[PDB]
Symmetry: C3
Subunit: 114 residues, 3 copies
């Protein structure tokens, strides 16, 4: 499926990976290899964190198809109910289906907030 939301600009980070910034819905696309795990985050219109800031947090590398303890799902000695689909995604309302662009780069993959 698809929708009518492809108004965003594509950018690159440093000299390795690349991420696109949504100048409207406030979304970003970040992923290691092509056709792999993806991640979406929110941005501020008062100060859009261009690649300059992105590369800063990206350098720390707290995902790599692993997802550090950033979200509510640390993935290490946790109760039954976890995050991702029960913590960082309140039903379909989750910011996972609010942009076609991100669906292209990420490849309609299950991305989680970072």
């Amino acid at each position: 499926g698809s929708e009518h939301l492809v108004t965003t600009a594509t950018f690159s980070i440093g000299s390795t990976g690349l991420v696109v910034y949504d100048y409207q819905q406030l979304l970003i696309a970040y992923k290691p290899a092509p056709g792999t795990c993806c991640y979406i985050m929110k941005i501020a219109p008062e100060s859009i964190p261009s690649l300059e800031a992105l590369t800063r947090k990206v350098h720390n590398f707290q995902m790599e198809c692993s997802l550090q303890a950033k979200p509510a799902v640390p993935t290490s000695k946790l109760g039954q109910a976890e995050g991702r689909d029960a913590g960082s995604a309140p039903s379909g309302g989750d910011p996972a289906f609010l942009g076609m662009a991100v669906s292209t780069l990420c490849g309609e993959v299950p991305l989680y907030y970072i």
Copy 2:
């Protein structure tokens, strides 16, 4: 000359070349070196073939300023009338002058369907 059609997003393929996807007119820009032969194709809104799919067909490399036997012009033991300008381009109606963006990347070069 130019027109009023620059609504598209630019993307990259793998870690070598890059191609832009037109989220409207359904067009794509693909080329080897800067200022060289170009190629335009159509895309589906139901499932836009992001770089993921592009790199797949691009990996096969069936052009390289040569154009394989993909189109109606195999370029090898064929009748008089050929393609390109007499097979893969029905007059000006050809999808060669329906986007300014592609005209920039391709460099207003005679691109043929792949």
Copy 3:
């Protein structure tokens, strides 16, 4: 601060740097390293100088956080009043605050006409 102007396409030059062409206000984003000096120029709608042209003049490298004798400020044996903020920027009207996108890539850095 920010505004409502993010309608532009991002492109890359050669195989090192990258620049975004503003298909409207006629502006381009050029800079060496991420989060460093930036440069903005005007383009023509009749013949948008794609990366092909950019790389041409860019190859000469007449800036590098130095700015050659291109503008009115050669930076070498010149009168009191110089350019940049007194030659290549007529008050706030200067083409430095006419695009949010450029402000992102450049990082709200002081750019000078090249």
